[PDB]
Amino acid sequence: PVLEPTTQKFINALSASGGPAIYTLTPAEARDVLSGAQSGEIAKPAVDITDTTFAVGPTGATKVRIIRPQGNTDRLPVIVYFHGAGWVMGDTGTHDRLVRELSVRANAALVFVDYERSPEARYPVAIEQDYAVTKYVAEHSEQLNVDPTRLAIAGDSVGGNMTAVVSLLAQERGGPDITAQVLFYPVTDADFDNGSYTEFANGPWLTKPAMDWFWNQYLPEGIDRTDPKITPIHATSEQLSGQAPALVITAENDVLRDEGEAYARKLSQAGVDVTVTRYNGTIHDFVMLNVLADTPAAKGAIAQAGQYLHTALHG
Amino acid sequence: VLEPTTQKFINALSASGGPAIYTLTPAEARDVLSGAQSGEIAKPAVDITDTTFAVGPTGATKVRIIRPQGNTDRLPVIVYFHGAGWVMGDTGTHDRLVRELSVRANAALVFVDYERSPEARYPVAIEQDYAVTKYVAEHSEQLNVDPTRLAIAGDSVGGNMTAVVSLLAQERGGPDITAQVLFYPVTDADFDNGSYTEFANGPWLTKPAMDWFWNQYLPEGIDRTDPKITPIHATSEQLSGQAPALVITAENDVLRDEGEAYARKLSQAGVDVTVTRYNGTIHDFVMLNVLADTPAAKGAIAQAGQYLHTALHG
Ligand SMILES: O=[N+]([O-])c1ccc(O)cc1
DSSP states (O other): OOOOHHHHHHHHHHHHHOOOOGGGSOHHHHHHHHHHHTOSOOOOOOEEEEEEEESOSTTSOEEEEEEEETTOOSOEEEEEEEOOSTTTSOOTTTTHHHHHHHHHHHTOEEEEEEOOOTTTSOTTHHHHHHHHHHHHHHHOHHHHTEEEEEEEEEEETHHHHHHHHHHHHHHHHTOOOOSEEEEESOOOOOOTTSHHHHHTTTOSSSOHHHHHHHHHHHSOTTOOTTSTTTOGGGOOHHHHTTOOOEEEEEEEEOTTHHHHHHHHHHHHHTTOOEEEEEEEEEETTTTTOGGGTTSHHHHHHHHHHHHHHHHHHHO | OOOHHHHHHHHHTTTSTTTOGGGSOHHHHHHHHHHHTOSOOOOOOEEEEEEEESOSTTSOEEEEEEEETTOOSOEEEEEEEOOSTTTSOOTTTTHHHHHHHHHHHTOEEEEEEOOOTTTSOTTHHHHHHHHHHHHHHHOHHHHTEEEEEEEEEEETHHHHHHHHHHHHHHHHTOOOOSEEEEESOOOOOOTTSHHHHHTTTOSSSOHHHHHHHHHHHSOTTOOTTSTTTOGGGOOHHHHTTOOOEEEEEEEEOTTHHHHHHHHHHHHHTTOOEEEEEEEEEETTTTTOGGGTTSHHHHHHHHHHHHHHHHHHHO
């Protein structure tokens, strides 16, 4: 694959580091790898941060980080954010710069759902936590000082899986109302033999054996993976129709590319207004990784998402 | 798979044979597109000045200068090269698109009304395009623009012109260009590549149409591999040092692959390239009024507008 030069340099750095493959590690080891990779010094938007817990979801409690453009005490539209990193990894640290950018560019409060990770928690704990926080935000707008009629959901990778599943759950349960949804390179299927899985089975960055491992951490052995709450590519027209306008951003060189774009087609053919954009020359995780933060694809996609959300939440 | 409104537009054309635009005279084709780009559509408000610059290989180039309505400041400036196959296109067909770019970029925009084919041939239009870009850089007080914040942009054959103007500026020592924007550019003349084969019979743009357009543009017998004709053939040294570029392609477009391949060449020559493919849409999707409310059109215009705003005011 022809990668943007800085992105190629990163990939070269990686294969020259000779590390062990992420899926040979323990969950705690894998968490620390990504946390350390994202611990470098890098400029970030100025925000006010409140870490707390909402007494909602199937475990009885869900940890959340609430972010707002620094010094802004107005009643703001709100983004509920579901982070990625394979269900196993990711935290408020790994995704900090990305979600700050979304909060400030959208001029919105952002509620980061620090959901229970896998394999300690399997399907469906996280998606139900995610749904419960989204409902909580919609129902406690005075307590959060947000406008619940301008509520967006967004996520990256497995977090894009959660975005689509929260949209589906909200359709089935009659709410809450969602203004717009943003999905960065979402996981939507478990077909490890499709076009982009084949083309990028060995990378860069994300591999087919890693996806196999991640799915196995997320799901109990033997469950039917075609359920749309697991692989939303299988959602019916009636489950997709009526959902909020969506922005789907894919990476050209990513095993997940084809399923993300196929899901966007399914949404569009159900009558949903879908903005779908492939960024050439970049890789999986390109709006999260600090090392790619100055590449044209990262800058362009974060700017596109931020402007999409600002228009949705303030237009 | 096409976005539903886009599909509906294509289905409205099912009796047109492509459209078989290449079966018409140049004047008839021009009127077909001009009519298609009439109707009802919202557009941003701009001030307009139609004039002629005494420049280019024929001694005169017609231009339309626009600015956000009522804005008297010294603005950054976009020089814009319109598409529609060298044969068609005018201030009317591209009006909504260039108004959006001007207002979203908060910039003056100089619309080059270059001599169209087959009345004019290569290289008249590209030399007019380069001459106007130079003229703008050198007459900034007359035009009330900031020539240190100058971008070039174009769609389709206008994207071909953008690439060629960038190259000519490299060869001739200027003017300096801050950014360049290329919507689904023409960069090659390989009618057997992947997207040409996949979309040979449409939608909207067909292989026979491209054959016709190229034949209207070029004198018989010229080597089409020259980079001032097919900039996909530009050397690393011709591409290196060019201004950062935004290249936007449509998924369902014979020209998709050459646009994306040209973005790759620019990127490997060290140019900072933002390259994005919009799925569900077709060739011409940021110009056509009938698609102006589709998500791809809205997204690509908002992206280009913000990219230009950042380049010219950052
Ligand atoms: O007006 N028309 O039918 C057209 C115009 C332009 C084009 O590229 C194809 C068909």
